[PDB]
Structure formats: C-alpha cells, structure tokens
C-alpha cells in the first residue's frame, strides 16, 4: 500500500508488559551478571549505541569555547586571477579555433570546482560563525535596553529632585 | 543487510511528521483502539534528549508525537480537524521549536 505497515514489535507490548518491565529488567540484569530476541520484553530495553558510532541510511553514511587563513585568502585571489586569465584564453580559443574549445572548458570548471571545495571546507569553519553575528546583535540590543533604562530612571530622579527644590522654595 | 531496530524506529519517528500518514493511521479503528500503538508512542518519548535528538532529520515530528501524546487525553474525534489545525498552528509551533533549540 501507500503507507507501510506499522513495525511488528509495536503490537507485542501491552500495559501488562509495561508494568512488568521493571522486574523483567531486574531479572535480566541479574542474569547478565546483536542482542538475541529470546523474550517478547527485550525491545523495551534501550538499544545499545553501535561501537563504530555510524549510521547508514538511503546509501549515505553519518557519524568548545562557543558552547594560515592568509594562505587560503591569497590562494583564492590567485585562483580568481587564473580563472579570469583562463576565461580570456578560452574565449580566444572560441574566437580562433572553437572546434577544440571544450578541451579548456571543463578545465576552467575544475578551478571553479576547486574554489567550491575551498568554499565547502569553509562551512564548518561560516555556519558556527552565524552564532557570532547573533552574539553581537543581542548583546547590542540588551545594551541599548539597559542604557535607556538608566537614562529614563535618571531623568525621573532629576525631575523628582527639581520638584523637591521647587517645593522647598515655596516653603 | 537487515537494518537494525534503530533505523526502523528513527524512520518511523521521522515519517510521523507527515500529516497524510497521521490521517491514514488514525483512519483505521484498530490502530487507535489497540493499546499497543499508544504504548509504543509513549515509549518513543525518550528521543527528545541528546544524543538521540542529534540523529533526527525533521524536528517537527518531535512536537507531533507530543501532540499525539495529548491525543490520548483529548479523546477518533478531532481527526477531521487535524490538517486544518496543523496548518493553522504551524507558525507558533515552529517558533516554540526554534526557541527550544536555536536559543
């Protein structure tokens, strides 16, 4: 069908199984002093984390104070200059002998791809740095809130003192 | 190879986020009538803590199951209103999820 059937073990655990789970796990721990399914109550025991700390799904694999970059900058500048130079040479190829133009085209793309690889390694280095730009925005917002609070209560205190002087003069 | 129970339970949890899946599951009488399914739903509650929460793909179901948790003391009745209510309350529920995680 369109919707896959519920998992099979779901139907094994009634309320009686839930209430008898404590004594079952106590007995299992006493006896113990891929997990084989010898009893229907085994699944409620929390599954163990794999030792490899890896998870595979759909053909893909998955697994501290925040809680030479100049070399990478100059490499990206020279790569951009070389990319412009290669674009000029490739368009010249199109001008004179376009029949073999593709021979350079993908080459240029490789450089673009290498710039994209630098810009990929650069993500775990920008994504966390978003929390930094957030840091200064809430910090400056709270400083503005604080400063307008001592300002307003100081101007209230000044008004009170002026009133006190006015009433003392009228005495 | 045969996937482990981790993979199937995680995929079930992430598929629970679909409104069509929830409507289909609640359409059948014996799914809600059987206490086994709700017992499994309450068993699934323990994934809201790390490091299990780091393995989720769509955080919305995190509330949905919790919302489904509410369904055991709110009633089946209300099944018809489920798509409308999720569409209407998506903004504030997304905001509260962001407050729970992004802050």
């Amino acid at each position: 069908s369109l919707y896959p059937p519920p998992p099979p073990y779901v139907k094994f655990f009634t309320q009686s199984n839930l209430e008898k789970l404590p004594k079952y796990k106590e007995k299992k721990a006493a006896s113990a002093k891929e997990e084989e399914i010898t009893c229907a109550l085994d699944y409620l025991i929390p599954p163990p984390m794999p030792k490899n700390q890896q998870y595979r799904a759909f053909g893909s694999i998955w697994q501290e104070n925040e809680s030479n970059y100049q070399y990478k900058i100059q490499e990206l500048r020279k790569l951009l200059k070389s990319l412009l130079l290669n674009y000029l040479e490739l368009i010249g190829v199109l001008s004179i002998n376009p029949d073999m133009y593709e021979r350079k085209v993908e080459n240029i793309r490789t450089i673009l791809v290498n710039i994209h690889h630098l810009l990929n390694e650069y993500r775990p280095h920008q994504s966390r740095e978003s929390l930094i730009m957030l840091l200064e925005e809430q910090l400056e917002y709270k400083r503005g809130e604080i400063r307008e609070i001592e300002q307003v209560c100081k101007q209230v205190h000044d008004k009170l003192t002026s009133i006190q002087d006015t009433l003392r003069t009228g005495s | 190879p045969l996937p482990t129970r981790f993979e199937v339970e995680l995929e079930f949890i992430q598929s629970l986020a679909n409104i069509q899946y929830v409507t289909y599951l609640l359409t059948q009488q014996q799914i809600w009538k059987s206490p086994n399914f709700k017992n499994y739903l309450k068993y699934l509650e323990y994934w809201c803590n790390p490091p299990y929460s780091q393995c989720i793909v769509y955080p919305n179901c995190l509330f949905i199951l919790k919302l489904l948790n509410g369904f055991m003391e709110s009633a089946l009745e209300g099944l018809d209103e489920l798509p409308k209510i999720i569409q209407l309350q998506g903004p504030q529920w997304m905001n509260e999820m962001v407050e729970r995680w992004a802050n």
Binding site: S1, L2 | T23, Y24, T27, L79, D80, E81, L82, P83, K84
Partner: peptide, 25 residues
C-alpha cells in the same frame, strides 16, 4: 419571488474517505 435562499452549509472540515492503495509500482 424566492422567500429565502439556503444558508451555505459547506463542510470543508470533512476529512473525506477516499481509499488510496495503488501507489506501489
């Protein structure tokens, strides 16, 4: 003429019961 028209009694909240099954190829 027409004494009174009918009040709109639409029920969009009705969930419908369309059976879906031939999805797998």
């Amino acid at each position: 003429p027409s004494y009174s028209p009918t009040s709109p009694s639409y029920s969009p909240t009705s969930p419908s019961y369309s059976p879906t099954s031939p999805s797998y190829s």
